[PDB]
Design a protein around this ligand. Structure first.
Ligand code: PEB
Ligand code: PEB
Ligand code: PEB
Ligand code: PEB
Ligand code: PEB
Ligand code: CYC
Ligand code: CYC
Ligand code: CYC
Ligand code: CYC
Ligand code: PUB
Ligand code: PUB
Ligand code: PUB
Lengths: 91, 219, 161, 160, 177, 161, 160, 148, 177
């Protein structure tokens, strides 16, 4: 369950984006994105505050970032808060 | 006098986090160490030196780094005969790894600012292999040889401290001004074969007068 | 995002005007180059794996980076590295086939400089890897299509630098 | 199939087929007879294609038919050419479909896990399909073998 | 004046509580490293006059304008007070090596010095150069790596203590500049 | 995070070398202190409640803080206060038993100074409560393990201040 | 490391370490000097394990050192033995760690993606590590090579 | 400079390792020329001022030295070159006295750079250095025009 | 062209006097050495061509830009001139071996070689690399530790002679750069 075994294009998991997260790694990124939706004017869902700030797990930050950019979000400030860097062992 | 922020029934009614909107963990307004050292008119020579050595790169990282960073005026203070003698040959063009050693001696991992050090005295290894004592006695904070002139400047991966003068590492090999060469013989018979000692002479049974003694045969 | 067509409809729309002869000349330019961009996208789609392999072999292997201490030293970091080269090739193909690098502004260059400067990915090596993909890709698609791919790989390199 | 792709697309957008979408269906249904020509030729020339492609495979790549390889012996070589026959069939399905959906879902989805479960070098399979590409492009016209050959190129890009 | 003992006591009085365990554990490391400290101070008590003479002679030879007329090492008397001040700096550094805390060096010698050398016109960078030469010479004597002097001692690692002495010289140097 | 062992494998790994005699001396140091760390963590696990009770009773109660207008006023705040003392004790035990304070960097001291300066939590009263837990905890586990816990409580106090 | 695994566990459960886990840490820190003996022996006998394991690898598997193979040539064979040296080093790290977390995060997480990006058959890598397991079990005791050999078995299970 | 190099660096090392000599020289000579600028009245009477006077001599020669190394005195004109005369007016500092001291520093600098100064005879192989001397005198009369 | 004899004589002529027993004693060490140098010259001049082939082939191996088009090793003509240049370099080195002094080697090849290779665009670092490989190969033959050919000689110390040979090759490699 480390997301890098047996990568797709011929591997039965349909292609999905796969992170360099170690099993249960503990590194997170403080991020600032902005989101304008699109689904709202045809869905008429109740309004929510689009501009937020959160600590995203490092293993899954990759996918969250791609997903923000897919829905026209704009990212302001990516810092790595939680983890240590360029450590070959111990996350 | 010291109100505790509470939206509803917490206390006084100060909006939460002592700000206009009741929100916390706001996006940081600070920038990287290289960016804050580059924005100011002083530390320009440090931005050039970190540009040359490539320790620009390690200071862009988001690990907590404290940079014990000398001003532009401070490098002017190296023009003492003593300082120009010690750091004089770094103005020769080949010397980049020595500048890397000096500038890695100025950067220290973790965060060590003012009142971690007030009272006590702490000894931390730098990014280079050498060690520095950081102490604060009687509201004075000094790192190694030179005292801190401006206290702490937050830069989102640690702290910048500003210093009156350039530190020296304890292991500093001054680059030679002129490159050294192994001694050439130029006369094998007179210099190689004359200075060398025959087995019999080494015993002392022969007479002494060898002009020299050889410790090596090389170029 | 937007292609060249959408960009023309953006300028003509934001002036309130209709489509005049200049905008139709721009659409004629794109519609002339259309088929060339299609076959280039076909070739790059065919040989993506070999592009990344030859470009990593040129640019990144047997150096300080894959030696211990470098940023590609482990298998985790190697796989993340070649993952990212995959994304640069794929979106560079979208940017080529749209004729407008706005996709590279929206879905690649956004937050990536903050990311790499946060984690410690060296920018220089990344740029040299992208240029290696530029040379290999230009060798596959030929001269004209290699110029087109060249402006988009150079766009990504200009983004990260 | 392009028609199916067009449907599912506006179905997930929950709308009727758009003006732009219909034109794509027109271009597809007018290109029909050409496609059926191509897959007719590769259908009726299949025996010749399987043989010649397998000859070029084993002659270029003497690894797998050597003693020690996967495909050593009569039975093994017959199984090898059996698979090249499979991929030829699937390529013809992808030509008539106008889409690589049939090639992908019959033959490519989870192929690396199967040939890793068989011990088979999948690069040799891709070389075999490239050999059949060369023979099938020798049997067609210029633009015609451009089209069909690019379907073969899709299968090679899935194997590599 | 405070030793390491009174430093632990003063810190515990800032905490306003009993000494307990951990501070005493660090002080037990001070006691077990005590004989190394004793032999180190013995290595600096003995070779000091020579070190002082060499360091100030090196200060003049690196910077020949001191012996030049209207320099602060020009007059013979000024050379005398120069040599004596080098001796006194080395003396209080040796006291800081015995105490283990720099309170003796800060209170007796360091406080009131910068303003004095400024008020006399003494060049401060030359003094910090002399302190640096006494630093390197003192670490070389303290690690038994001096060329003209290699006295036998039972072997052991003492890098902690070398960093300690270099911290005091660094401190003296910092104060002047 | 990382323990002392992982840190040794980090330095030896990031040099590319194998394990030399120095690193084996460091592993011998940790493996000597192993059992002591275990029984210390056992005792703290046993008496956490009493450590927090005695330390709150010494450091915080019957003062301006639990009087109205102080930060501790109201039940919700009191329970949050003693909850935070529980976290400091628990993560201080983790840091002791790993032999490396990296856990305190990752999961406690991250953003905590910004949190307490955002809320208006008094830093000095927090530090004195942590030092009260340091004295009581050192009284339970004894001299050597009290020194070990002393460096990790002092690490958190250095983190907040 | 086992200690690290033990922590993270009660940290995510937000509790102190259980009785059980603390007994496990006791058993680990008492088994320490035996582990350091094992990694000492595999440290100082690395050249015999890499050389002899490479000999048994290339003698069992003449594919990759044959012409038109991944390990062909002097430099390619030297790179092959270089990687066997890497996995030997990582196995020693996993022995002193008392857990395969160093082995997994330095060497195994994403290994198949890398060797598929290099064109290397990873089954040959697993056969190489099995050969070094046989040599390393020839250099140790019974229970000792059971333990170290089981660390090698973990690496084999990750490659296959 | 690739031709100058060891010669330009040699000159900078000649001026730098005579710094206390040139500073105390020119300031002591400044006082010698006029007795009105040591007496009560002028700024040399107080000990505190005298210290800042020696510091200003050292700073002038220090930045002047930097200019030789840095080719043009942008490092000097960045801070010291501009706004100095406004300060010396706003603090009552005499400007003719400073201009004299900078002239004495200039003459001692050229006499050190050509080894014609009797008393220091550091051993260098001979060459032509007139251009570089004119750059040194060029910088001292840049500053010497800026004090007045 | 000056051998060790003429070097003694020229040094005595600059001294402007006769020979003297000290210089004659060093000359007795040279002549007393003798057939070690003879057998050494026989070793290098024996395997000379093969040294040149291996060293130049290795020089092409370390940087393949020479054999790349636009490189100076590209085509047959350039390769032939390459091989004869390595051969003549080795020839003058063997001359400096028999002579005992570099006067024969230096005037013929040390002086003016740099100007010639700069004028022709020959990469000098590649030449110093080739001289370095001929140095290592020639010292390995001169110590008779070569892994392909090992001929019988009555054992003794050829080390004194060998350092000399490495000094000649370091003179050539220092000269070409
Ligand atoms: C009253 C004065 C007085 C002294 C001056 C010391 C001198 C001294 N040192 C040691 C003992 C020692 N001294 C040192 C010191 C050294 N370590 C090195 O690397 C250096 C060579 C050197 C510091 C410069 C060491 C390492 C030992 C222990 C030697 C050993 O046990 O191997 C001993 C034996 C007793 C002991 O182990 O402590 C004595 C008497 N003791 C005194 O009572
Ligand atoms: C307790 C600590 C302590 C010190 C650190 C000294 C510091 C000190 N030095 C001097 C005084 C002096 N110090 C020096 C020293 C110098 N000569 C030079 O060439 C160099 C710049 C420098 C040595 C590096 C000289 C020359 C004087 C006499 C100055 C004079 O009379 O002109 C004086 C004035 C009293 C006197 O004349 O002795 C004092 C307080 N004294 C103390 O009590
Ligand atoms: C790091 C410190 C550092 C220095 C201080 C200089 C020192 C220096 N000067 C020269 C070399 C020289 N230096 C001078 C200088 C002069 N000769 C005169 O007669 C004038 C008195 C004086 C005017 C400045 C001259 C003329 C040469 C020789 C010419 C030249 O090399 O350009 C050389 C060449 C090598 C050699 O001569 O052995 C070097 C290294 N270079 C450095 O790297
Ligand atoms: C970077 C370049 C640079 C300079 C060139 C100086 C210039 C300068 N000098 C002074 C200040 C001073 N400068 C002098 C100097 C003088 N004493 C006299 O008898 C003479 C007329 C003259 C020396 C020739 C004096 C005495 C003061 C103090 C004046 C006072 O406080 O009355 C000040 C005000 C701050 C201070 O008090 O130090 C400044 C900016 N400072 C710099 O940062
Ligand atoms: C006319 C041609 C001609 C030669 C080519 C030489 C050959 C030669 N070499 C030696 C003799 C020798 N030759 C060598 C040489 C060496 N031994 C080593 O192990 C090194 C590899 C090598 C360095 C050069 C040694 C060491 C001796 C024996 C010691 C000595 O005689 O000085 C002898 C003495 C007689 C004998 O050994 O039978 C002779 C005739 N002399 C000649 O007249
Ligand atoms: C510490 C974890 C770690 C590992 C294991 C690692 C492996 C690694 N193996 C490589 C190449 C290689 N590895 C092999 C290995 C083999 N060939 C075979 O046929 C055999 C099955 C096998 C040897 C047993 C070969 C041939 C290459 C080079 C292939 C090529 O460049 O064409 C490279 C390319 C560049 C370089 O080596 O510097 C890396 C980074 N890197 C890491 O960080
Ligand atoms: C679609 C636009 C887009 C891009 C490009 C992107 C990149 C991206 N690269 C990452 C890591 C990384 N990327 C690299 C890349 C490299 N290392 C080198 O030395 C080379 C120069 C280079 C490969 C060519 C490495 C080593 C890491 C992980 C570093 C670490 O975790 O320590 C991560 C961290 C977490 C994760 O991958 O899941 C992201 C999100 N994300 C995006 O949304
Ligand atoms: C329609 C999609 C589809 C495919 C492709 C497919 C393949 C397939 N290939 C098989 C075996 C095989 N396939 C090969 C193929 C090759 N050997 C080589 O060296 C060459 C690279 C390659 C031929 C080009 C070999 C040797 C075997 C048998 C291996 C063995 O049994 O030991 C088997 C095992 C049992 C059986 O064939 O009945 C299946 C099911 N099955 C499917 O449903
Ligand atoms: C282990 C990881 C971790 C820690 C340590 C932690 C601390 C933490 N302390 C908090 C609040 C607080 N913390 C305190 C603490 C104190 N008040 C006092 O007077 C004392 C001097 C001092 C404690 C010694 C108080 C009163 C609040 C509540 C502020 C408020 O929301 O009203 C909050 C805001 C959430 C809430 O409690 O309502 C966090 C998140 N959070 C974490 O995830
Ligand atoms: C020509 C003007 C002149 C001098 C005067 C010397 C002065 C001098 N001594 C040094 C350093 C120095 N000095 C000594 C002490 C000294 N050596 C001994 O072995 C004994 C018995 C001593 C007293 C008699 C030691 C032990 C060192 C450390 C270097 C070493 O290992 O010798 C250093 C190096 C400083 C540094 O490392 O930063 C200098 C500059 N140098 C000069 O250029
Ligand atoms: C009685 C009040 C009084 C003084 C005080 C001096 C001060 C003085 N020194 C000068 C100039 C001067 N001063 C020195 C420095 C000096 N000489 C050396 O050889 C060494 C070692 C020195 C420091 C110890 C040099 C090198 C010169 C340049 C002239 C020369 O070649 O000596 C000049 C000439 C200025 C000019 O050229 O415009 C003067 C006025 N003159 C006075 O009337
Ligand atoms: C892959 C690119 C490549 C090469 C090409 C070689 C080239 C080479 N030959 C060497 C050195 C070398 N070469 C020979 C000559 C050679 N050996 C013999 O036994 C016979 C018969 C020879 C000619 C056919 C000898 C005798 C030596 C000395 C070492 C030895 O004892 O073999 C050395 C060592 C240089 C040194 O010591 O500094 C190198 C680098 N190396 C490479 O990496």
């Amino acid at each position: 369950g480390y997301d890098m075994d047996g990568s797709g294009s011929g591997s039965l998991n349909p292609l999905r984006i796969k992170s360099s997260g170690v099993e249960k790694d503990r590194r997170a990124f403080k991020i600032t994105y902005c989101l304008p939706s699109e689904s709202r004017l045809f869905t008429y869902r109740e309004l929510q505050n689009v501009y937020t700030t959160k600590l995203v797990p490092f293993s899954s930050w990759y996918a969250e970032q791609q997903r923000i950019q897919k829905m026209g979000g704009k990212i302001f400030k990516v810092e790595l808060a939680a983890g240590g860097q360029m450590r070959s062992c111990g996350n | 006098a010291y109100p505790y922020t509470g939206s509803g029934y917490g206390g006084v009614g100060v909006p939460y986090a002592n700000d206009k909107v009741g929100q916390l963990y706001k996006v940081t307004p600070t920038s990287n160490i290289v960016d804050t050292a580059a924005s100011v008119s002083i530390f320009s020579t440090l931005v050039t030196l970190l540009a040359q050595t490539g320790l620009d790169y390690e200071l862009k990282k988001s690990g907590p780094f404290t940079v014990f960073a000398p001003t532009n005026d401070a490098f002017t203070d190296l023009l003492n005969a003593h300082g120009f003698a010690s750091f004089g040959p770094l103005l020769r063009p080949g010397n980049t790894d020595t500048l890397r050693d000096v500038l890695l001696y100025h950067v220290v991992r973790g965060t060590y600012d003012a009142r971690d050090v007030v009272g006590k005295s702490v000894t931390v290894e730098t990014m280079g292999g050498d060690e520095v004592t950081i102490s604060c006695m009687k509201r004075k904070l000094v790192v190694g040889s030179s005292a801190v002139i401006r206290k702490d400047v937050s830069c989102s991966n640690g702290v910048i401290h500003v210093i009156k003068s350039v530190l020296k590492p304890p292991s500093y090999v001054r680059p030679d001004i002129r490159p050294q060469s192994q001694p050439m013989p130029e006369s094998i018979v007179q210099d190689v074969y004359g200075k060398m000692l025959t087995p019999r002479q080494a015993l002392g049974i022969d007479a002494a007068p060898e002009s020299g003694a050889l410790t090596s045969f090389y170029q | 995002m937007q292609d060249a067509i959408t960009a023309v409809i953006n300028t003509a729309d934001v002036q309130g005007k209709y489509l005049d002869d200049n905008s139709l000349d721009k659409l004629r330019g794109y519609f002339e180059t259309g088929e060339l961009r299609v076959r280039a996208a076909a070739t790059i789609a065919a040989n993506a794996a070999t592009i990344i392999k030859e470009s990593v072999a040129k640019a990144l292997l047997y150096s300080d980076i894959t030696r211990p201490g470098g940023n590609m030293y482990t298998t985790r970091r190697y796989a993340a590295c070649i993952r990212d080269l995959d994304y640069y090739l794929r979106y560079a193909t979208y940017g080529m086939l749209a004729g407008d690098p706005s996709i590279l502004d929206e879905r690649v260059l956004n937050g990536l400089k903050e990311t790499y400067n946060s984690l410690g990915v060296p920018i220089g090596a990344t740029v040299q890897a992208i240029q290696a993909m530029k040379e290999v890709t230009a060798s596959l698609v030929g001269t004209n299509a290699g110029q087109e791919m060249a402006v988009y790989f150079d766009y990504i390199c200009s983004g990260l630098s | 199939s392009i028609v199916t792709k067009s449907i599912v697309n506006a179905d997930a957008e929950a709308r009727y087929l758009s003006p732009g979408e219909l034109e794509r269906i027109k271009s597809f249904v007018l290109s029909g007879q050409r496609r059926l020509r191509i897959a007719q030729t590769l259908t009726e020339n299949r025996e010749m294609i399987v043989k010649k492609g397998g000859q070029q495979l084993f002659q270029k790549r003497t690894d797998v038919v050597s003693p020690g390889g996967n495909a050593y012996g009569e039975e093994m070589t017959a199984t090898c050419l059996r698979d090249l026959d499979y991929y030829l069939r699937l390529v013809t399905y992808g030509i008539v479909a106008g889409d690589v959906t049939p090639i992908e879902e019959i033959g490519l989805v989870g192929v690396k896990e199967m040939y890793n479960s068989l011990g088979t070098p999948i690069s040799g399979v891709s070389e075999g399909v490239r050999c059949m590409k060369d023979v099938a492009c020798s049997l067609l016209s210029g633009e015609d073998s451009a089209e069909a050959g690019f379907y073969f190129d899709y299968t090679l890009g899935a194997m590599q | 004046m405070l030793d390491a003992f009174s430093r632990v006591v003063v810190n515990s009085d800032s905490k306003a509580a009993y000494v307990g365990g951990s501070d005493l554990q660090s002080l037990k490391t001070f006691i077990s490293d005590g004989n190394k400290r004793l032999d180190a101070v013995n290595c600096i008590v003995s070779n000091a006059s020579c070190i002082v003479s060499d360091a100030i002679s090196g200060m003049i030879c690196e910077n020949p304008g001191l012996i030049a007329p209207g320099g602060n090492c020009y007059t013979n008397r000024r050379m005398a007070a120069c040599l004596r001040d080098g001796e006194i700096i080395l003396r209080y550094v040796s006291y800081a090596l015995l105490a283990g805390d720099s309170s003796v060096l800060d209170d007796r010698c360091l406080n009131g010095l910068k303003e004095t050398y400024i008020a006399l016109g003494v060049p401060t960078a030359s003094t910090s150069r002399a302190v640096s030469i006494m630093k390197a010479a003192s670490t070389a004597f303290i690690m038994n790596t001096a060329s003209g002097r290699k006295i036998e001692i039972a072997a052991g690692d003492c890098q902690a203590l070398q960093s300690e002495a270099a911290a005091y010289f660094d401190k003296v140097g910092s104060a002047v500049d």
